[PDB]
Amino acid sequence: SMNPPPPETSNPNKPKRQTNQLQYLLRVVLKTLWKHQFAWPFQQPVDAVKLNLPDYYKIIKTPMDMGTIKKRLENNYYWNAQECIQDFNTMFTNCYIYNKPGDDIVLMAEALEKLFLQKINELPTEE
């Protein structure tokens, strides 16, 4: 029933890079999903106490959300595109694992995921 600490968004000894792919992940991918009418349940970590989801963190062991991804991108937390891409996939997958097929939250994740795929399809070549 209690909330874990959020995922890490700062770590001084973690290696990191600023790259055209990671810039595309922020400027195009994150920006496009963030603005969407279904973005709101995905803009911060799930609060299991406020939402009354006491099982959430007994089921979801690698939590992820766009608030976390946004801070990672803004704070140049990543080494490569694939790390960031994995965070999005974890976010969508957790939603489908926890929630009941057909629930509104699943339909919202599905709309964001469709856009995500369309945008990562055009991930630019590394420079």
Ligand SMILES: Nc1nc(-c2cc(Br)cc3ccoc23)c2nc[nH]c2n1
């Ligand atoms: N059942 C459920 N609710 C939510 C969810 C619902 C509501 Br109202 C507001 C917020 C803000 C973070 O989370 C929210 C989820 N966000 C991601 N997966 C979620 N699964």
